[PDB]
Scaffold this active site. Sequence first.
Site, PDB file in Angstrom:
ATOM      1  N   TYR A  50      11.853   5.271   2.100  1.00 50.64           N
ATOM      2  CA  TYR A  50      11.754   4.708   3.481  1.00 50.64           C
ATOM      3  C   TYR A  50      11.680   3.175   3.451  1.00 50.64           C
ATOM      4  CZ  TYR A  50       6.823   4.177   2.247  1.00 50.64           C
ATOM      5  OH  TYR A  50       5.661   3.884   1.611  1.00 50.64           O
ATOM      6  N   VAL A  69       0.853  -1.214   0.000  1.00 53.75           N
ATOM      7  CA  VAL A  69       0.000   0.000   0.000  1.00 53.75           C
ATOM      8  C   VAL A  69       0.876   1.246   0.000  1.00 53.75           C
ATOM      9  CG1 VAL A  69      -2.020  -1.111   1.011  1.00 53.75           C
ATOM     10  CG2 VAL A  69      -0.298  -0.086   2.519  1.00 53.75           C
ATOM     11  N   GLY A  70       2.200   1.085  -0.075  1.00 55.98           N
ATOM     12  CA  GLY A  70       3.138   2.211  -0.060  1.00 55.98           C
ATOM     13  C   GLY A  70       4.552   1.756  -0.365  1.00 55.98           C
ATOM     14  N   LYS A  71       5.248   2.490  -1.229  1.00 57.11           N
ATOM     15  CA  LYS A  71       6.684   2.258  -1.553  1.00 57.11           C
ATOM     16  C   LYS A  71       7.345   3.629  -1.619  1.00 57.11           C
ATOM     17  N   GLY A  72       8.579   3.765  -1.152  1.00 58.49           N
ATOM     18  CA  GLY A  72       9.314   5.041  -1.168  1.00 58.49           C
ATOM     19  C   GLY A  72      10.754   4.842  -0.764  1.00 58.49           C
ATOM     20  N   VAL A  91       5.266  -0.147   2.789  1.00 59.46           N
ATOM     21  CA  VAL A  91       4.215  -0.542   3.756  1.00 59.46           C
ATOM     22  C   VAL A  91       3.283  -1.534   3.088  1.00 59.46           C
ATOM     23  CG1 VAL A  91       2.349   0.126   5.279  1.00 59.46           C
ATOM     24  CG2 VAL A  91       4.337   1.660   4.960  1.00 59.46           C
ATOM     25  N   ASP A 146       8.010  15.611  11.690  1.00 64.74           N
ATOM     26  CA  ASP A 146       7.713  15.436  10.249  1.00 64.74           C
ATOM     27  C   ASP A 146       6.194  15.383  10.049  1.00 64.74           C
ATOM     28  OD1 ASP A 146       8.234  15.226   7.526  1.00 64.74           O
ATOM     29  OD2 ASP A 146       8.720  13.109   7.629  1.00 64.74           O
TER      30      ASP A 146
END
Length: 283
Positions: free
Chosen positions: A18, A13-16, A21, A133
């Site tokens: 970091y 549900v998330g890639k970056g 997720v 942040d």
Amino acid sequence: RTVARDITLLECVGKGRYGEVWRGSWQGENVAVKIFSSRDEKSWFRETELYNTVMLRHENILGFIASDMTSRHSSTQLWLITHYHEMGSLYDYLQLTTLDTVSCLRIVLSIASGLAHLHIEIFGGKPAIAHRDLKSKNILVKKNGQCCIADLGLAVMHRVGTKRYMAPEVLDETIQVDCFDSYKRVDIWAFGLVLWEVARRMVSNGIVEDYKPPFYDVVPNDPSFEDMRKVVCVDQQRPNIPNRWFSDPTLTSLAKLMKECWYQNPSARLTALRIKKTLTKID
Ligand SMILES: COc1cc(-c2cncc(-c3ccc(C4CCN(C)CC4)cc3)c2C)cc(OC)c1OC
Ligand SMILES: COc1cc(-c2cncc(-c3ccc(C4CCN(C)CC4)cc3)c2C)cc(OC)c1OC
Ligand SMILES: COc1cc(-c2cncc(-c3ccc(C4CCN(C)CC4)cc3)c2C)cc(OC)c1OC
């Protein structure tokens, strides 16, 4: 006794930078699994150290479940496991969703509630915490219409913040780094930007603004530190307040509130507790 540690990773549900997720499943229940990049290993250590110091439990703070370190052949795998919010981030949500007065206020008061909880020292309790942040991608939307604050990888108890959301004293390097209140005041600046992002999406008199990130009209898509310094510090620009807000009592009150988060002088900015009080007296 059996200690069931298997988590089924179901979808990314998330890639970056970091890492990633995932939506995962443990014992039939959705969890969120953040898998850290080598770039961001210190964020896992910092958040883990904070939760080892104080087990935060608040409806407007993303709920901790576990920190896991697993030995691999030639690397260390670091996972943070939290509650899962299927509606995703506030940033995501605001892209297509518009708000009414009730939903807009519920969102921003829930964020102020989470932030005041981080900021306050409780005796007997919790240390004071600054987030460092705060932004719309680090806020999740819950099905009950409230939000929760996420990502304590840069948090400080008593990596740099996202440049687009940095306060003037961070950009001009005047921040009083040996005063914990300095870090609370940096969060309040960022809160005021988030409040502007949300208010734009609140309908009044059949009018709404498109979703835009703060400073979209004055810095590049991926702004440099210097780009931000010139806007925020040298020219002292602030996000535009559209005329149509001044026909609506809620958006008139929210414009005054965001202005009081954006003073150049950090000690002039409202506290999170004062923001809460002001929000409870609107509409
Ligand atoms: C190690 O790792 C993971 C463990 C778990 C997990 C799975 N079943 C049961 C447990 C459990 C909790 C608490 C006790 C108590 C009982 C009373 N006494 C006073 C002290 C001990 C025992 C067992 C846990 C913690 C989940 C995980 O992921 C969701 C884990 O991986 C991160
Ligand atoms: C990490 O996360 C989750 C863990 C668990 C879980 C599994 N086994 C046992 C436990 C447990 C039992 C008992 C005590 C206490 C009770 C009173 N006194 C005697 C001290 C000991 C603590 C812990 C838990 C909490 C379930 C979860 O979800 C249902 C979790 O969330 C994903
Ligand atoms: C900000 O940071 C963290 C966030 C999370 C987290 C918690 N619940 C749900 C999510 C999520 C789920 C689903 C979508 C999408 C799916 C596709 N659809 C089209 C729109 C919605 C987005 C987001 C996340 C990303 C967990 C974290 O740690 C484990 C985070 O880091 C601290």
